[PDB]
Design a protein around this motif. Structure first.
Motif, PDB file in Angstrom:
ATOM      1  N   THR A 121       0.834  -1.194   0.000  1.00 48.51           N
ATOM      2  CA  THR A 121       0.000   0.000   0.000  1.00 48.51           C
ATOM      3  C   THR A 121       0.882   1.264   0.000  1.00 48.51           C
ATOM      4  OG1 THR A 121      -0.180   0.101   2.414  1.00 48.51           O
ATOM      5  CG2 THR A 121      -1.812  -1.273   1.260  1.00 48.51           C
ATOM      6  N   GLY A 122       0.284   2.399  -0.345  1.00 44.59           N
ATOM      7  CA  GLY A 122       0.965   3.685  -0.334  1.00 44.59           C
ATOM      8  C   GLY A 122       1.342   4.081   1.077  1.00 44.59           C
ATOM      9  N   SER A 123       0.470   3.794   2.054  1.00 43.77           N
ATOM     10  CA  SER A 123       0.776   4.133   3.455  1.00 43.77           C
ATOM     11  C   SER A 123       1.976   3.301   3.997  1.00 43.77           C
ATOM     12  CB  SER A 123      -0.462   3.993   4.338  1.00 43.77           C
ATOM     13  OG  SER A 123      -0.950   2.661   4.307  1.00 43.77           O
ATOM     14  N   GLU A 124       2.155   2.065   3.490  1.00 46.68           N
ATOM     15  CA  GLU A 124       3.305   1.209   3.840  1.00 46.68           C
ATOM     16  C   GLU A 124       4.595   1.876   3.331  1.00 46.68           C
ATOM     17  OE1 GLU A 124       2.777  -2.788   2.349  1.00 46.68           O
ATOM     18  OE2 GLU A 124       3.874  -3.646   4.060  1.00 46.68           O
ATOM     19  N   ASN A 130       9.511   7.785   5.718  1.00 43.18           N
ATOM     20  CA  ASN A 130       9.589   8.635   6.913  1.00 43.18           C
ATOM     21  C   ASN A 130      10.631   8.144   7.925  1.00 43.18           C
ATOM     22  OD1 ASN A 130       7.742  10.658   6.258  1.00 43.18           O
ATOM     23  ND2 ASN A 130       6.008   9.461   6.989  1.00 43.18           N
ATOM     24  N   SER A 131      10.855   6.837   7.997  1.00 49.24           N
ATOM     25  CA  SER A 131      11.847   6.269   8.914  1.00 49.24           C
ATOM     26  C   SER A 131      13.255   6.132   8.311  1.00 49.24           C
ATOM     27  CB  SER A 131      11.374   4.922   9.454  1.00 49.24           C
ATOM     28  OG  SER A 131      11.481   3.911   8.463  1.00 49.24           O
ATOM     29  N   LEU A 132      13.458   6.531   7.034  1.00 50.68           N
ATOM     30  CA  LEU A 132      14.773   6.446   6.388  1.00 50.68           C
ATOM     31  C   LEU A 132      15.801   7.332   7.070  1.00 50.68           C
ATOM     32  CD1 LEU A 132      13.985   6.402   2.557  1.00 50.68           C
ATOM     33  CD2 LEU A 132      14.530   4.467   4.039  1.00 50.68           C
ATOM     34  N   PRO A 133      17.018   6.809   7.272  1.00 52.56           N
ATOM     35  CA  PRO A 133      18.047   7.611   7.945  1.00 52.56           C
ATOM     36  C   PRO A 133      18.613   8.761   7.121  1.00 52.56           C
ATOM     37  CG  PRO A 133      18.528   5.228   8.024  1.00 52.56           C
ATOM     38  CD  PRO A 133      17.490   5.441   6.991  1.00 52.56           C
ATOM     39  N   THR A 134      18.786   9.920   7.774  1.00 56.13           N
ATOM     40  CA  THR A 134      19.324  11.133   7.159  1.00 56.13           C
ATOM     41  C   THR A 134      20.871  11.176   7.257  1.00 56.13           C
ATOM     42  OG1 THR A 134      19.014  12.485   9.166  1.00 56.13           O
ATOM     43  CG2 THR A 134      17.135  12.404   7.613  1.00 56.13           C
ATOM     44  N   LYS A 135      21.505  12.101   6.511  1.00 50.60           N
ATOM     45  CA  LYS A 135      22.958  12.318   6.465  1.00 50.60           C
ATOM     46  C   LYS A 135      23.767  11.081   6.001  1.00 50.60           C
ATOM     47  N   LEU A 155       6.304  11.325  -5.244  1.00 46.50           N
ATOM     48  CA  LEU A 155       6.904  10.024  -5.529  1.00 46.50           C
ATOM     49  C   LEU A 155       6.090   8.805  -5.113  1.00 46.50           C
ATOM     50  CD1 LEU A 155      10.574  10.960  -4.626  1.00 46.50           C
ATOM     51  CD2 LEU A 155       9.581  10.722  -6.933  1.00 46.50           C
ATOM     52  N   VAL A 156       5.438   8.828  -3.948  1.00 40.86           N
ATOM     53  CA  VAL A 156       4.718   7.658  -3.442  1.00 40.86           C
ATOM     54  C   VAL A 156       3.706   7.073  -4.461  1.00 40.86           C
ATOM     55  CG1 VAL A 156       3.086   6.824  -1.667  1.00 40.86           C
ATOM     56  CG2 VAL A 156       5.198   8.015  -0.998  1.00 40.86           C
ATOM     57  N   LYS A 208      15.997  -0.382  -1.456  1.00 38.49           N
ATOM     58  CA  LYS A 208      16.028  -0.568  -0.007  1.00 38.49           C
ATOM     59  C   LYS A 208      14.615  -0.417   0.570  1.00 38.49           C
ATOM     60  CE  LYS A 208      19.920   0.685   2.267  1.00 38.49           C
ATOM     61  NZ  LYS A 208      21.145   1.434   2.681  1.00 38.49           N
ATOM     62  N   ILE A 209      13.781   0.504   0.010  1.00 43.97           N
ATOM     63  CA  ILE A 209      12.394   0.657   0.458  1.00 43.97           C
ATOM     64  C   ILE A 209      11.632  -0.647   0.189  1.00 43.97           C
ATOM     65  CG2 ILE A 209      10.173   1.879   0.112  1.00 43.97           C
ATOM     66  CD1 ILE A 209      12.063   4.344  -0.705  1.00 43.97           C
ATOM     67  N   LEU A 210      11.768  -1.224  -1.010  1.00 45.39           N
ATOM     68  CA  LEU A 210      11.120  -2.491  -1.334  1.00 45.39           C
ATOM     69  C   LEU A 210      11.608  -3.609  -0.390  1.00 45.39           C
ATOM     70  CD1 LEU A 210       9.252  -4.255  -3.061  1.00 45.39           C
ATOM     71  CD2 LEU A 210      11.197  -4.603  -4.639  1.00 45.39           C
ATOM     72  N   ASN A 211      12.938  -3.718  -0.213  1.00 45.77           N
ATOM     73  CA  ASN A 211      13.525  -4.720   0.658  1.00 45.77           C
ATOM     74  C   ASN A 211      13.088  -4.556   2.117  1.00 45.77           C
ATOM     75  OD1 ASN A 211      16.050  -6.659  -0.447  1.00 45.77           O
ATOM     76  ND2 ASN A 211      15.271  -5.136  -1.856  1.00 45.77           N
ATOM     77  N   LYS A 212      12.962  -3.318   2.630  1.00 45.05           N
ATOM     78  CA  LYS A 212      12.516  -3.107   4.012  1.00 45.05           C
ATOM     79  C   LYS A 212      11.052  -3.556   4.191  1.00 45.05           C
ATOM     80  CE  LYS A 212      12.706  -1.673   8.338  1.00 45.05           C
ATOM     81  NZ  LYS A 212      13.685  -2.146   9.345  1.00 45.05           N
ATOM     82  N   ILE A 213      10.199  -3.347   3.169  1.00 43.52           N
ATOM     83  CA  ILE A 213       8.806  -3.788   3.219  1.00 43.52           C
ATOM     84  C   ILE A 213       8.771  -5.314   3.298  1.00 43.52           C
ATOM     85  CG2 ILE A 213       6.623  -3.919   1.918  1.00 43.52           C
ATOM     86  CD1 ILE A 213       7.353  -1.182   0.674  1.00 43.52           C
ATOM     87  N   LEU A 214       9.546  -5.987   2.436  1.00 42.01           N
ATOM     88  CA  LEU A 214       9.623  -7.438   2.422  1.00 42.01           C
ATOM     89  C   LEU A 214      10.190  -7.977   3.735  1.00 42.01           C
ATOM     90  CD1 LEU A 214      10.853  -7.971  -1.266  1.00 42.01           C
ATOM     91  CD2 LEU A 214       8.534  -8.138  -0.410  1.00 42.01           C
ATOM     92  N   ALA A 215      11.182  -7.287   4.316  1.00 42.13           N
ATOM     93  CA  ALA A 215      11.772  -7.695   5.589  1.00 42.13           C
ATOM     94  C   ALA A 215      10.741  -7.535   6.714  1.00 42.13           C
ATOM     95  CB  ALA A 215      13.007  -6.845   5.894  1.00 42.13           C
TER      96      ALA A 215
END
Ligand SMILES: Cc1cn([C@H]2C[C@H](O)[C@@H](COP(=O)(O)OP(=O)(O)OP(=O)(O)O)O2)c(=O)[nH]c1=O
Ligand SMILES: [Cl-]
Ligand SMILES: [Mg+2]
Ligand SMILES: [Mg+2]
Length: 698
Positions: A121-124, A130-135, A155-156, A208-215
DNA sequence: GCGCTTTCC
RNA sequence: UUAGGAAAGCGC
C-alpha cells in the motif's frame, strides 16, 4: 550524486517538484513498463539537477610476507578476491531437496501466507520513507533518502505503481540489481590481508524501500519460523539469555562427578557472503513461503551485481552468484531462516547428544551465525555434529571459520582428551572463550577475574583517552561508560564485591571533576533484580531461566525452606527481598499472587481446580475474590463454584475468606509491584526499576 | 512521540 | 566510500 543543499532552495525545490509532475504526464501512457519508466525518471531527474547546478587501502600483503603499495595491483588483488568469493553458485539441486526433506521444518499457514502476499500500500511506502536515515550516502544512482522524503507526495503514487508492477511480473528495474561495496576493517584483525575486510553494500534507496517492506512482512512471522534458541536479529529477544544459559551449563559440568562433555563455540566464515541462493529459495518454499512474496525474493536474487569502491575508483562490476548483501534489511532474516535448517537438524539428531540438566535438554544457543553447542559424550556426539555440518555445508555453502571457533572439553583422563582433540578442526580453550563481548570461563569460579577485573581496567583506559565541561563529561560517562557496565551486569549478574563499585566511582568521579549522575550501584541492583520479572512471567521460551542447579524462585508467593550454589537467582532473590524491606512491603501474599501458587497448592488443592479457576476467572487470587468477595464479584464467579470439587471449594473459601488473606490480597498495589506484574513486555525494565530505586535509596 | 549514544552480529 | 538487524540506555 545528489547535493542535499539543493533541496533546501525554494527555486530548485519548485523547479524539481514540477519536473517530477511533468515527467509522469509526458512519459506515462506510452509503450513502456513502470520498471523502465522509473529508471528513465531517475536518469531525467539526475540530468535536471546537473543543469540546475551549471578510507584507503595502501598495502595488501600475501601469505608469504610480500606486500604491494601499487594502487592498480591492490585494486586487482581485491577485485579478483571478492569476485571469486561470490562466483560459484551450487548446482546440486537434488541434494538440496534431500537435506530439506530429512528434517521436520515449520510451515506458515494460509493466514500467515496471505499476510506475506498482501499487496503493498501507499501508506506502507510512506512509513518506510519517513523512517529512512538522514545524512547517509546515496546508493549508486545518486539519490539520497532526503530526496524521497522531500518529494514524498509526488513520488509515493509512482513508487506504488512500480511496486504493484513488480508484484505482477516478478520483474525489477535494472538499477535494482546494483550496489556499491565499501570495504571496512574487521576490529583487531590484520588490515593488510584481503580476507580481513568486511564488504558493506550501499544499495539504491528505491530498492532498499522495497527490501525493508519485504523484511517487515516476514519479521511478523519470524517467531513461528525460528526456534527460541536463536536470539540474534529476533525481536523481543536478548543476547544475555544465551550467556546466562551457557554459564549455568558450564557450572553443571564443573559440578558433575563424571566429566564427558564439550561446549563448542562455532562461528560461520563470512556468514552472509557464503549463503547459497538456490538453497535459500528452496528453504523459503519448504516453509510455505510462495506466491507473490517468493516471486519478488527470487527476482531480487536473480542477477544482483556489485561495484567495489576503492581508492577513488569504482571498480568493474561482478555478479553476486552467492550471498545476501551486508547492508540489506532482508539479509538478517533470510540468513537466520537458512541457518535454522541446520539448527532444526542438530536438535532433531538424537545421536548428537546434548547436556541433560534435569528435565531440560540443552543442545544449542544461536546469535546470528554464532552457535554454542552443548554436548555429552563428545567422542561420538562431536563427530556426528561435524558430519551433519559437512552435509549442510554441501547444500547451503555454510563453512565453519576454524580460526574463530573454539571449545571447552571435559573428560576424565588425558587419553580421551587427546583422542577427541585430534579429531576436531578447531582449538580447545583451557581458560576462556570470548562470546558476545564477555569471557566464558572453563570454571565458573573465574567469572569475576576474567570479566569484571578487565572491565575496571578498560574503563580507566576510556578515561585516559578522553576539552570538555563537567556537565559534558557526565554525558560522556552516560553515553560510553554506562552501556558497557550495564551490558556486563546483564550478561553476568553475579554478586560483586563493594570494591568494584568503589574503584568504578573513583575512576568516574576523577574523569568528571578533572582530579543527575549515573548511580552504578543502583544500575547493578536494577539489572540483578530485573530477573524477577521473568520468574513471574514463567515463559516457555525462557529455558535460560530453568538451567540453575536447583526449589523454584518465585515472586509474590510464599517462600520455601531452601540453591546454595546458585550463580544468579539466589543473589536476585536477596536483592528483591532487601528492596521490598526498604519499601515496607509484604511481598509474599499480594494482589498479584497467582491462583497457581504455593499458597493455593499448600492447601492440597487439585491442579484441575486451579485450571478451572484460571480459565473462568483470571490468574490471581484477587481475581477469584477474598473476604466477602470470595467467588462472588461476578455472576461468572458465583457459577464457577459449581465446576470446582466440593472439598477444594471448602479449602479455598477457608483460605480466601481469612482476615489475614483479605488484608494482604485486597490492598492497593505499589508502583514497584506493578513493574513486576502488569507488564507483558520486558522493554525498558532497567530504566523503570532504576527510576523507582532512585525514589527509594536517594 | 521525537532525538542521541552504546552492546552484540 | 560505514550499510543493515536485534537489544540496552540516556534525554527533552
Ligand atoms: C559485524 C557485522 C555483521 N553483520 C552480518 C553479516 C555477517 O556475515 C554476519 C556475521 O558477522 P561476523 O561473524 O562478525 O562476520 P562474517 O561471518 O561475515 O565473517 P567472519 O569469517 O570474520 O566471521 O552478520 C553485518 O551485517 N554487519 C556487521 O557489522
Ligand atoms: Cl475441581
Ligand atoms: Mg520461535
Ligand atoms: Mg562469522
Amino acid at each position: 550524486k545528489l547535493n542535499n543543499l539543493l533541496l533546501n532552495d525554494y527555486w530548485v525545490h519548485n523547479e524539481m517538484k514540477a519536473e517530477i509532475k511533468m515527467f509522469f504526464e509526458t512519459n506515462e501512457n506510452k509503450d513502456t513498463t513502470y520498471q523502465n519508466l522509473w529508471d528513465a525518471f531517475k536518469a531525467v531527474c539526475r540530468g535536471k539537477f546537473i543543469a540546475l547546478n551549471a578510507n584507503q587501502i595502501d598495502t595488501i600483503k600475501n601469505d608469504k610476507g610480500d606486500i604491494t603499495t601499487d594502487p592498480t595491483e591492490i585494486q586487482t588483488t581485491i577485485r579478483e578476491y571478492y569476485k571469486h568469493l561470490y562466483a560459484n553458485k551450487l548446482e546440486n539441486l537434488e541434494e538440496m531437496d534431500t537435506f530439506l526433506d530429512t528434517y521436520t521444518l515449520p510451515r506458515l499457514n494460509q493466514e500467515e501466507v496471505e499476510s506475506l502476499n498482501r499487496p503493498i500500500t501507499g501508506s506502507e511506502i510512506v512509513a518506510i520513507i519517513n523512517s529512512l536515515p538522514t545524512k547517509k550516502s546515496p546508493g549508486p544512482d545518486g539519490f539520497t533518502a532526503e530526496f524521497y522524503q522531500r518529494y514524498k507526495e509526488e513520488l509515493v503514487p509512482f513508487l506504488l505503481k512500480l511496486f504493484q508492477s513488480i508484484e505482477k511480473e516478478g520483474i525489477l528495474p535494472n538499477s535494482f540489481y546494483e550496489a556499491s561495496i565499501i570495504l571496512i576493517p574487521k576490529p583487531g584483525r590484520d588490515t593488510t590481508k584481503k580476507e580481513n575486510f568486511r564488504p558493506i553494500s550501499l544499495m539504491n534507496i528505491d530498492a532498499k524501500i522495497l527490501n525493508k517492506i519485504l523484511a517487515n512482512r516476514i519479521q511478523q512471522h519470524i517467531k513461528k519460523l525460528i526456534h527460541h534458541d536463536q536470539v540474534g536479529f529476533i525481536p523481543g529477544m536478548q543476547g544475555w539469555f544465551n550467556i546466562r544459559k551457557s554459564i549455568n551449563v558450564i557450572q553443571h559440568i564443573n559440578r558433575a562427578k563424571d566429566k564427558n562433555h564439550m561446549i563448542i563455540s562455532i562461528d560461520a566464515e563470512k556468514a552472509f557472503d557464503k549463503i547459497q541462493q538456490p538453497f535459500m529459495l528452496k528453504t523459503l518454499n519448504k516453509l510455505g513461503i510462495d506466491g507473490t512474496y517468493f516471486k519478488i525474493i527470487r527476482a531480487i536474487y536473480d542477477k544482483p551485481t556489485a561495484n567495489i569502491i576503492l581508492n577513488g575508483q569504482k571498480l568493474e562490476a561482478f555478479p553476486l552468484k552467492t550471498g545476501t548483501r551486508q547492508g540489506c534489511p532482508l539479509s538478517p532474516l533470510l540468513f537466520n531462516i537458512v541457518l535454522e535448517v541446520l539448527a532444526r537438524a542438530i536438535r532433531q539428531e538424537k545421536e548428537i547428544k546434548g547436556i541433560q540438566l534435569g528435565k531440560e535438554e540443552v543442545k544449542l544457543s544461536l546469535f546470528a551465525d554464532d552457535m554454542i553447542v552443548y554436548l555429552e559424550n563428545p567422542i561420538v556426539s562431536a563427530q556426528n555434529l561435524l558430519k551433519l555440518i559437512s552435509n549442510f555445508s554441501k547444500v547451503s555453502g555454510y563453512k565453519i571459520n576454524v580460526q574463530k571457533s573454539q571449545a571447552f572439553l571435559y573428560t576424565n583422563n588425558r587419553q580421551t582428551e587427546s583422542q577427541i582433540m585430534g579429531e576436531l578442526p578447531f582449538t580447545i580453550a583451557s581458560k576462556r572463550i570470548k562470546y558476545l563481548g564477555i569471557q566464558l570461563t572453563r570454571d565458573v569460579k573465574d567469572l569475576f577475574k576474567e570479566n569484571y577485573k578487565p572491565l575496571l581496567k578498560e574503563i580507566k583506559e576510556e578515561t585516559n583517552k578522553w576539552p570538555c565541561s563537567w556537565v559534558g563529561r557526565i554525558n560522556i560517562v552516560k553515553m560510553a561508560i554506562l552501556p558497557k557496565v550495564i551490558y556486563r551486569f546483564n550478561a553476568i549478574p553475579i554478586k560483586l564485591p563493594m570494591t568494584f563499585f568503589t574503584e568504578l566511582e573513583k575512576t568516574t568521579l576523577k574523569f568528571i571533576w578533572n582530579q543527575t549522575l549515573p548511580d552504578f550501584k543502583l544500575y547493578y541492583k536494577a539489572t540483578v533484580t530485573k530477573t524477577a520479572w521473568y520468574w513471574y512471567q514463567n515463559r516457555d521460551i525462557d529455558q535460560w531461566n530453568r538451567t540453575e542447579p536447583s526449589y523454584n524462585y518465585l515472586i509474590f508467593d510464599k517462600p520455601e525452606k531452601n540453591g546454595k550454589d546458585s550463580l544468579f537467582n539466589k543473589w536476585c532473590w536477596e536483592n528483591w527481598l532487601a528492596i521490598c524491606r526498604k519499601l515496607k512491603l509484604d511481598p509474599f501474599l499480594t494482589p498479584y499472587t497467582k491462583i497457581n501458587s504455593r499458597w493455593i497448592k499448600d492447601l492440597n488443592v487439585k491442579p484441575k481446580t486451579i485450571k478451572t479457576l484460571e480459565e473462568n476467572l483470571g490468574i490471581t487470587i484477587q481475581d477469584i475474590g477474598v473476604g466477602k468477595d470470595f467467588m462472588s464479584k461476578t455472576p461468572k464467579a458465583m457459577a464457577t463454584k459449581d465446576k470446582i470439587d466440593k472439598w477444594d471449594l471448602i479449602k479455598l473459601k477457608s483460605f480466601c475468606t481469612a482476615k489475614e488473606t483479605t488484608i494482604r490480597v485486597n490492598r492497593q498495589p505499589t508502583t514497584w509491584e506493578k513493574i513486576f506484574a502488569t507488564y507483558s513486555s520486558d522493554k525498558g525494565l532497567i530504566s523503570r526499576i532504576y527510576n523507582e530505586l532512585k525514589q527509594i535509596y536517594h
